[PDB]
C-alpha cells in the first residue's frame, strides 16, 4: 500500500520536513510531487525520471526542495505557510499511475 509519512509531522519554522514514501509499486517510470491534494501541473513542485535520473523543477518549486530516487521529498527551511497537503503521482513503466496525498504542519 503506497503511503507518505511526514518526518516530522509537525515541524518548527526554519527546520525541515521529509515526506517519506513507502511501498512504491514495482516498475516505476518516475515521480512528480504536487502542492495540495490533487495532481495539477500548475502545482507541480519537482519530479524525477528514473531512466536518465532527470530532475524536473516545476512551477511550484521554491528552491527548497529535493526529490530522492526513492520518491521522497525533502523541504528545507519550512514556514507556517507550508502547512497543508502534498500529493505524489507515480507513473509506472506501462504509463498507468498511482496517486497518494500526505500532509504536515509548521508552527
Amino acid at each position: 500500500q503506497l503511503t507518505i509519512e511526514a518526518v516530522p509531522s509537525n515541524a518548527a519554522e526554519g527546520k525541515e520536513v521529509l515526506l517519506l514514501v513507502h511501498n512504491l509499486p514495482q516498475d516505476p517510470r518516475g515521480y512528480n510531487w504536487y502542492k495540495g491534494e490533487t495532481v495539477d501541473a500548475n502545482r507541480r513542485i519537482i519530479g524525477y525520471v528514473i531512466s536518465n535520473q532527470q530532475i524536473t523543477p516545476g512551477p511550484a518549486y521554491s528552491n527548497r526542495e529535493t526529490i530522492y530516487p526513492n520518491a521522497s521529498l525533502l523541504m528545507r527551511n519550512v514556514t507556517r505557510n507550508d502547512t497543508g497537503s502534498y500529493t505524489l503521482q507515480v507513473i509506472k513503466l506501462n504509463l498507468m499511475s498511482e496517486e497518494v496525498t500526505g500532509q504536515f504542519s509548521v508552527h
Binding site: 495539477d40 524536473t56 499511475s97
Partner: protein, 107 residues
C-alpha cells in the same frame, strides 16, 4: 495550452459525443482519461500507450468509450450519468505531465 473541446456540447441521450484534445505536447507518450475534474484513480476511464496502442480500462470504463491516438475520446450511447466533466492527463517522456478538463451535457 492543452484544452478539451466537446462536440457537440449538448448531447441527446442515446447519441454520441467526441472529446477532442487541442494543443497536444510534442513529447507525449501516453494518455489517461478520467471522469470528473481531476486525476483520480477511482475515476480512471482508460489509460493509453501511444507507441503500442494499448488501452487499459479503469473503474469508470463503461464499454462505450474509445480512445484514439490523438487522445480524442468517443463516448457512445450516452446516458444522464455520463453528463459533466472529463479530465485528460497527457503523459510525456520527461514526465512533466499536462492536464486539461472538458465537459458535456446530456439532455
Amino acid at each position: 495550452k492543452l484544452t478539451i473541446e466537446s462536440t457537440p456540447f449538448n448531447v441527446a441521450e442515446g447519441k454520441e459525443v467526441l472529446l477532442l484534445a487541442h494543443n497536444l505536447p510534442q513529447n507525449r507518450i501516453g494518455y489517461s482519461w478520467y471522469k470528473g475534474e481531476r486525476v483520480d484513480g477511482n475515476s480512471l476511464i482508460v489509460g493509453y500507450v501511444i507507441g503500442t496502442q494499448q488501452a487499459t480500462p479503469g473503474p469508470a470504463y463503461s464499454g462505450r468509450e474509445t480512445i484514439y491516438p490523438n487522445a480524442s475520446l468517443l463516448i457512445q450511447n450516452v446516458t444522464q450519468n455520463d453528463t459533466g466533466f472529463y479530465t485528460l492527463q497527457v503523459i510525456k517522456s520527461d514526465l512533466v505531465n499536462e492536464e486539461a478538463t472538458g465537459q458535456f451535457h446530456v439532455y
